[model samples]
Target: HFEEGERVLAKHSDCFYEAKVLKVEFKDNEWKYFVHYIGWNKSWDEWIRLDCLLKH
Candidate 1:
């Protein structure tokens, strides 16, 4: 589990990267999340499954 501002890694497409947790939500018995990350393009934000992330 993660809290706001906690650092985490998110799996996307074919890779994983560092990100910051912004928000956490629970719905339909699943954990949903929002995060901000630094990618090859630029700073970006996205929604992801909490179960797919790892705290660091």
Candidate 2:
């Protein structure tokens, strides 16, 4: 599990990239993370599941 302000790796198109944890939420009985991808467009800021994130 991670927290807001934490830096983590996120999955995208089978590849991973650096992202900043903006918020954490519980939905559909699972922990979800809202992340802002570094070096990516603002539109890329989106929600992600744990499986799609890798610990740094």
Candidate 3:
């Protein structure tokens, strides 16, 4: 699992964008990561599936 403030790559459509992990939390029985895309607006920040994330 990624720690908060860690750098990562997140999948969006067919592209992978650089992101920073903001918060990690458990929802239901699954874990979700709150991420902020680098150089992007805060409006783009959202929770993402683990499968959609990778090490930067």
Q: Using TM-score as the measure, which candidate wins?
A: 3
TM-score, prediction 3: 0.94
lDDT of 3: 0.95
| Tens digits of lDDT, candidate 2, 1-56 | 89798998999778999999999999879999999999988788999899999999
Candidate achieving the largest lDDT: 3
lDDT of 3 by residue, 1-53 (tens): 99999999999889999999999999899999999999999999999999999
- lDDT (10s digit) by residue, model 1, range 1-56: 68988888888777778887889888899888888885543346878996668877
Ranking by TM-score: 3, 2, 1
TM-score of each: 0.78, 0.89, 0.94
Candidate models: Cα lDDT each = 0.80, 0.91, 0.95
Better of 1 and 3 by TM-score: 3
| Clash-forming residue pairs, model 3 | none
Q: How accurate is candidate 1 locally (lDDT)?
A: 0.80
Candidate 2 residues lying further than 4 Å off, grouped into runs, are: none
> Which of the two candidates, 1 or 2, achieves a greater lDDT against the reference?
2
Off by over 4 Å in 1: 39-43
